[PDB]
Amino acid sequence: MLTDPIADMLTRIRNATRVYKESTDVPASRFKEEILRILAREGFIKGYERVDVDGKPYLRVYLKYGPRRQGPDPRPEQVIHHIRRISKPGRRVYVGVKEIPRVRRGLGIAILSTSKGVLTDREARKLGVGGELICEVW
Amino acid sequence: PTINQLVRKGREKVRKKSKVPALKGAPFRRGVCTVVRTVTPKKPNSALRKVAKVRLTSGYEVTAYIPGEGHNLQEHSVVLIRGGRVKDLLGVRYHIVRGVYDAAGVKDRKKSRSKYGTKKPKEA
Amino acid sequence: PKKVLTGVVVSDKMQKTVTVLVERQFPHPLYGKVIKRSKKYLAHDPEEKYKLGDVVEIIESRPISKRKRFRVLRLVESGRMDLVEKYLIRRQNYESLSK
Amino acid sequence: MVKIRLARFGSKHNPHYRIVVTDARRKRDGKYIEKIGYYDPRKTTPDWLKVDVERARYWLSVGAQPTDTARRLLRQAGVFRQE
Amino acid sequence: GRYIGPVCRLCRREGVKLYLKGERCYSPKCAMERRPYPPGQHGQKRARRPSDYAVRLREKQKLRRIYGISERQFRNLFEEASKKKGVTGSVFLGLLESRLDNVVYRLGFAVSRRQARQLVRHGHITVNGRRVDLPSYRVRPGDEIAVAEKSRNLELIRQNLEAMKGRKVGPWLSLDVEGMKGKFLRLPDREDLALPVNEQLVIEFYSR
Amino acid sequence: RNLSALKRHRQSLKRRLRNKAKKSAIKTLSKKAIQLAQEGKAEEALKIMRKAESLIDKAAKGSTLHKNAAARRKSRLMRKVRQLLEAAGAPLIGGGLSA
RNA sequence: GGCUAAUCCCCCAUGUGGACCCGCCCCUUGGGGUGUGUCCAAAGGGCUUUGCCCGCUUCCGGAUGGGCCCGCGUCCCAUCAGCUAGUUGGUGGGGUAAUGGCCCACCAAGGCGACGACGGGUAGCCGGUCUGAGAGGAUGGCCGGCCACAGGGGCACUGAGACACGGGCCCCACUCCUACGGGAGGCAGCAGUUAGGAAUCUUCCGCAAUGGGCGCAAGCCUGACGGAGCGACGCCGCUUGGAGGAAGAAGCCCUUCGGGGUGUAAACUCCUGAACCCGGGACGAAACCCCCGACGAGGGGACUGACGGUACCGGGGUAAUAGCGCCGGCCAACUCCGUGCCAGCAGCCGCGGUAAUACGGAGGGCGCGAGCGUUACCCGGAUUCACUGGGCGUAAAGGGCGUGUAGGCGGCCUGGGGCGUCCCAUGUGAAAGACCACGGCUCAACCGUGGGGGAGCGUGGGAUACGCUCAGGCUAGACG
Numbered sequence A: 001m002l003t004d005p006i007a008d009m010l011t012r013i014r015n016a017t018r019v020y021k022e023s024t025d026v027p028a029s030r031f032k033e034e035i036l037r038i039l040a041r042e043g044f045i046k047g048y049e050r051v052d053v054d055g056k057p058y059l060r061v062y063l064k065y066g067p068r069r070q071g072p073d074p075r076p077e078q079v080i081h082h083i084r085r086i087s088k089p090g091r092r093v094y095v096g097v098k099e100i101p102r103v104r105r106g107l108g109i110a111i112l113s114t115s116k117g118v119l120t121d122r123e124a125r126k127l128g129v130g131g132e133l134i135c136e137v138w
Numbered sequence B: 001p002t003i004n005q006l007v008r009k010g011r012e013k014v015r016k017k018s019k020v021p022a023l024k025g026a027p028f029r030r031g032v033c034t035v036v037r038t039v040t041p042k043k044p045n046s047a048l049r050k051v052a053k054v055r056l057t058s059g060y061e062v063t064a065y066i067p068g069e070g071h072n073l074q075e076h077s078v079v080l081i082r083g084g085r086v087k088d089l090l091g092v093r094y095h096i097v098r099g100v101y102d103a104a105g106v107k108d109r110k111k112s113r114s115k116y117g118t119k120k121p122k123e124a
Numbered sequence C: 001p002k003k004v005l006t007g008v009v010v011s012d013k014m015q016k017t018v019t020v021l022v023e024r025q026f027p028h029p030l031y032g033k034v035i036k037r038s039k040k041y042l043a044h045d046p047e048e049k050y051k052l053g054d055v056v057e058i059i060e061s062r063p064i065s066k067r068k069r070f071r072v073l074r075l076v077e078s079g080r081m082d083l084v085e086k087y088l089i090r091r092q093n094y095e096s097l098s099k
Numbered sequence D: 001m002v003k004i005r006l007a008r009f010g011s012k013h014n015p016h017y018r019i020v021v022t023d024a025r026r027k028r029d030g031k032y033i034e035k036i037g038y039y040d041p042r043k044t045t046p047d048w049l050k051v052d053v054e055r056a057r058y059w060l061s062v063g064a065q066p067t068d069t070a071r072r073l074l075r076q077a078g079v080f081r082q083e
Numbered sequence E: 001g002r003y004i005g006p007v008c009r010l011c012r013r014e015g016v017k018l019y020l021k022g023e024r025c026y027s028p029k030c031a032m033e034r035r036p037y038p039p040g041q042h043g044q045k046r047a048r049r050p051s052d053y054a055v056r057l058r059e060k061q062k063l064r065r066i067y068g069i070s071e072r073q074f075r076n077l078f079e080e081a082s083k084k085k086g087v088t089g090s091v092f093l094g095l096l097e098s099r100l101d102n103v104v105y106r107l108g109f110a111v112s113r114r115q116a117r118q119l120v121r122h123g124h125i126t127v128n129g130r131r132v133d134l135p136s137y138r139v140r141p142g143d144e145i146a147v148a149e150k151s152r153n154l155e156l157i158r159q160n161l162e163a164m165k166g167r168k169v170g171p172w173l174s175l176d177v178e179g180m181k182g183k184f185l186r187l188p189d190r191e192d193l194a195l196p197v198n199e200q201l202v203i204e205f206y207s208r
Numbered sequence F: 001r002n003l004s005a006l007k008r009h010r011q012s013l014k015r016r017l018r019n020k021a022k023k024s025a026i027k028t029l030s031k032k033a034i035q036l037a038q039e040g041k042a043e044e045a046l047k048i049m050r051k052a053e054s055l056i057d058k059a060a061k062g063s064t065l066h067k068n069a070a071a072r073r074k075s076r077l078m079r080k081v082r083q084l085l086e087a088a089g090a091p092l093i094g095g096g097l098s099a
Numbered sequence G: 001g002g003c004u005a006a007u008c009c010c011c012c013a014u015g016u017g018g019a020c021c022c023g024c025c026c027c028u029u030g031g032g033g034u035g036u037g038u039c040c041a042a043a044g045g046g047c048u049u050u051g052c053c054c055g056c057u058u059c060c061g062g063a064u065g066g067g068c069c070c071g072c073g074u075c076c077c078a079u080c081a082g083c084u085a086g087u088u089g090g091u092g093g094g095g096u097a098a099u100g101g102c103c104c105a106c107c108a109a110g111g112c113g114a115c116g117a118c119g120g121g122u123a124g125c126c127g128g129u130c131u132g133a134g135a136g137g138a139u140g141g142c143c144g145g146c147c148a149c150a151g152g153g154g155c156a157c158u159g160a161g162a163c164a165c166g167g168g169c170c171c172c173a174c175u176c177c178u179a180c181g182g183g184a185g186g187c188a189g190c191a192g193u194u195a196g197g198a199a200u201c202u203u204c205c206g207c208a209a210u211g212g213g214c215g216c217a218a219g220c221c222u223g224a225c226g227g228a229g230c231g232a233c234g235c236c237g238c239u240u241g242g243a244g245g246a247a248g249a250a251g252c253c254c255u256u257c258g259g260g261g262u263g264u265a266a267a268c269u270c271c272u273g274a275a276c277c278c279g280g281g282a283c284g285a286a287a288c289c290c291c292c293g294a295c296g297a298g299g300g301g302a303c304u305g306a307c308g309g310u311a312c313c314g315g316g317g318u319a320a321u322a323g324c325g326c327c328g329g330c331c332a333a334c335u336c337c338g339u340g341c342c343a344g345c346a347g348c349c350g351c352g353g354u355a356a357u358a359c360g361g362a363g364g365g366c367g368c369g370a371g372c373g374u375u376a377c378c379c380g381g382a383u384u385c386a387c388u389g390g391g392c393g394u395a396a397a398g399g400g401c402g403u404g405u406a407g408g409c410g411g412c413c414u415g416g417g418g419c420g421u422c423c424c425a426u427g428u429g430a431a432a433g434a435c436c437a438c439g440g441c442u443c444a445a446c447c448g449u450g451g452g453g454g455a456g457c458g459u460g461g462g463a464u465a466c467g468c469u470c471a472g473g474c475u476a477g478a479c480g
């Protein structure tokens, strides 16, 4: 099957961006949609789209990079420098409000899934909820 | 390993053996020379090394090394064992503490004297 | 707070005494993932109302025999015969792993 | 039976007492039921007596027994003062 | 029994001037007047690239020597300065400079650090009016450190004092040369003191 | 040597004695009364049961019994008697028994 | 064998009440209420002696201390895989303050285990301590809590309470008395002895304080306890001096024989004044008691200090112990002799076989200092058991391959519930300790007062994104 939907999302993005692709289809979910909404508003993807490929629902994820590097290796600086899953099917991670990490000196974020819904560490913290810690981004 | 492996079996704390049974956990143990003599060292080194097989309050009969420049020990001297070993000859897990029980201290030693157990000398 | 749990009835074989199988999850104090674990309670069925495969709330009660400290509370559920044939197969399995 | 007493607290030659409710059978310095004051016999500082009447009035009402040294301290604090 | 035995050797090892003698350390003697090399046989030798250890140990020793203090004392102080909230090096200087014996020196009642120690130990000083004899004693600000009334005619006191008339005193202190009384009013920042120690090296030394 | 308030032991015997031959007195009568129930003679039985109950409570006056081993023995007896009074008994005296 | 008193033991009455069987009322496991029968009380003593005090008796509460029971947590070995006959349950009964196979009689044939039963080994748990960035690891001496034991094993008695350390009984081992019949002990209370060991203290003072027993009180008892002693065992404070003092003495070391070094170090000069001597001298102690009032509230009065003529205060006063480890690299600190694979060092690399910064002594130096080394044991480094935080093509490491059991894991959409999860309130999280703040000993160690934090579990209330689960639906996986 696909054992983590989400991981595989994050990954698609990762190998996508590493190879500098202008964007990518990922197979569609209300949740995976939340996550990219957050991921987007928060600066990391150009934005995304709800597409249909071969009669099946996909989300296109458009993809942003920084400008052209000089010298040898002109490959431009990544925006999504790193993205990684935290909670994993059969090993879960749930955090108090006092336990919500904070990321790369605040230069990145966490994504939490709460009963206030999906939100960033900062958002949770001001909201005052905890939840499953989905992912590290920075 | 997976997680479900760590829950299933899970990691193994591993313990360490002792480099010595002075037993007791004792810091030192009293003994009696059974025999005393001189041995040849190991690998690159030549020497005549000074040592005494000693019988113990801990019940075992061991080989200990008599440190420093002269010594006084013979058939049944009685002596104290501290342990710490000698790499260059083998079977010696322990040193004799000089200056205790029937073992003298090394006399004339000016230089490092707590080890070797010699009293501080006076002058004018 | 007189403690009360839930379980399945895995045993008929005593007069007024049923055996109840009760599971609980809880996260692993170190490796941190939920573990599912379970325990068996002999419980007091005065009139032999509960039959096997039933799901029942179970309760803390003044003592009845050695082994018997809980009396049946109510009937929550009728005929989950799956949990039953489950535990029963585990048990049949003991018969390997032997001599 | 239940008693209000003193427990020794400061160091050697520097005693500070704890004014305290507890069963008689107890060790002197061992676990006690409520701390009701402190008393510093050598009067080292401005206030060497805390009592808090309110509460020692209670224990008395419910059958607490003060030791007399305790009683003196107590009543210095007018736990007993009647009107 | 904290260091008692030839000093101008230490002025020397540490390779920069220490004023452990007070006056004369201002003369053309401090021995670092022409013989600034380190002590011993091999002290006039071309010396060798310093280990990173050496550097930080020697920076410690330079501060410890300066203030006259035992290791155990020095460390226990530094530990105590870690613990406190605030920048650890600077606090440490605070705490040093707040030792009674040092205030007594820095108030000018004595020629030298050691001299103030003796001054103290022997009873010649009063803090807020009680005689206080231990050089450890920590001077709070607000505190007034002054010479003992019964001790006010001593030669040594007058020499020092009278010829402190007019010199300015450390800006975290006040002096009154009539009462032989002075106030420690604040705490020294690291540029209030001048010491030729980069303290952070000493932090670095205990980090190991 | 000679701890003098070992005297306590010395008493405990006299005391032990007393206690034993209260208990026993009681035990005997009780048995007898119960017996008379199964013989159906409820006149004689009730009379004896009555004396047993006096005695028990009276011996609960002291250290001997006290408590509720008062009640316990009382209850036990009176029931075993009444319950034993029908193989058809018409409970004659009813000194001790509640109509 | 014989007299004899009581708050000792009985018998009769009174029945506020309580106890028990039976019936009903309410209530929900044996909780209350009530009626009928039955059964159950008691002890005097003192005075300021006709009314007060210390006692007795039955009931109902409080309070404190406990029993018992449940969830959860709680070391190694699977080269321990099966275990179980009071075993597991049931009816009746014994017993007990009380539940229960705690025991007993007769029925049923069950209970338990790879979610590690049974066996073996080891160990008193905890508040906390040590270490660590943390996570973890390791530990449970002192102080508090809980348990167990009292030469080994059984047992009960008395009692509110024990199956009782200085109570009882029997067996056993040991010691001692013995007229050989038979008897007596029990320091794992404080001291002390002996033995064992590398090793662990005075047969001290005191009942002043605090605390406990009895006593109406006076008081008595108190090796609990307050104190003193001995050990650098630890921690903290302090001393063996401060300022001057040479272009820099002798001695000693090095020397390229010019000079370099110890070294302002000494000598010497001038201040100060540890030790010690004199004087004065505590706090810790104010109640019990006694007097007025009313034995209350309140007020007045009296006694009492082991530590101790100690702490502290004032006067006088002497320049007054320093040692131990290191100097080849890890690592701060170098030269000359001596020695010649010897003697020796050695934590590890390794040194020594005639120019040894590595052995041994010297001068010099580095580090700490009334201490400094050593051995032993824990944690660290060691991300070398890897949760944080490792790996498996050749380095150690993918099972020889397959089928599936237990188990782990689980696509897309909607609704229910709300177990996991998140939040809020609340109860618990004793004191000690740790953290912060002020404060008390001249400082500190040590001590007080206050404040803060807290995982975890109980309870009530709330959210529903993710996990579960139940209901529905879909087809991208799977199958046909």
Ligand SMILES: [Mg+2]
Binding pocket: A096
């Ligand atoms: Mg939480």
Ligand SMILES: [Mg+2]
Binding pocket: B001
């Ligand atoms: Mg791993």
Ligand SMILES: [Mg+2]
Binding pocket: B044, B045, B046, G341
């Ligand atoms: Mg060799």
Ligand SMILES: [Mg+2]
Binding pocket: B076, B077, B102
């Ligand atoms: Mg001999």
Ligand SMILES: [Mg+2]
Binding pocket: B084, G347
């Ligand atoms: Mg070693």
Ligand SMILES: [Mg+2]
Binding pocket: B099, B100
């Ligand atoms: Mg010796």
Ligand SMILES: [Mg+2]
Binding pocket: B112
């Ligand atoms: Mg050596």
Ligand SMILES: [Mg+2]
Binding pocket: C012, C013, C014, C016, C048, C050, C051
């Ligand atoms: Mg059945």
Ligand SMILES: [Mg+2]
Binding pocket: C064, C065
């Ligand atoms: Mg039963």
Ligand SMILES: [Mg+2]
Binding pocket: C071, C072, C073
């Ligand atoms: Mg029920």
Ligand SMILES: [Mg+2]
Binding pocket: none
């Ligand atoms: Mg089987």
Ligand SMILES: [Mg+2]
Binding pocket: D024, D025, D026, G212
């Ligand atoms: Mg007591």
Ligand SMILES: [Mg+2]
Binding pocket: D025
């Ligand atoms: Mg108790």
Ligand SMILES: [Mg+2]
Binding pocket: D047, D048, D049
């Ligand atoms: Mg007051």
Ligand SMILES: [Mg+2]
Binding pocket: E081, E082, E083, E084, E085, E086, E087, E088
């Ligand atoms: Mg800090």
Ligand SMILES: [Mg+2]
Binding pocket: E171, E172, E186, E187, E188, E189
């Ligand atoms: Mg300032």
